[PDB]
Amino acid sequence: PVDARTLQSATAALAADTGQAVNRAQHVSMLTNRLTTANAPTVRAITVLT
Amino acid sequence: PVDARTLQSATAALAADTGQAVNRAQHVSMLTNRLTTANAPTVRAITVLT
Numbered sequence: 001p002v003d004a005r006t007l008q009s010a011t012a013a014l015a016a017d018t019g020q021a022v023n024r025a026q027h028v029s030m031l032t033n034r035l036t037t038a039n040a041p042t043v044r045a046i047t048v049l050t
Numbered sequence: 051p052v053d054a055r056t057l058q059s060a061t062a063a064l065a066a067d068t069g070q071a072v073n074r075a076q077h078v079s080m081l082t083n084r085l086t087t088a089n090a091p092t093v094r095a096i097t098v099l100t
Contacts, residue, residue, distance in 0.1 A: 023073050025065035
């Protein structure tokens with residue numbers, strides 16, 4: 001089991017630090033749209049194995 | 051035959067490097083809207099001929 005913490009707080013801080021605009025294309029967006037927690041349980045088991 | 055690679059990855063990188071805005075008019079757009087792969091087989095045959 002893991003604590004259920006939303007990504008909105010983390011994403012909002014990142015958008016503020018590196019100004020994110022809906023109108024413009026930025027490197028920060030390429031990082032943000034690629035975020036996914038689907039495979040999180042698998043990676044955290046790899047972390048223990050290492 | 052040629053490998054089928056989409057232009058989205060190439061265009062997205064170009065838009066990020068040179069900031070592309072829907073609101074503003076930029077030199078990068080004039081390059082992007084003019085992209086076309088319709089005559090690609092003809093040009094690649096010219097390349098071999100040279």
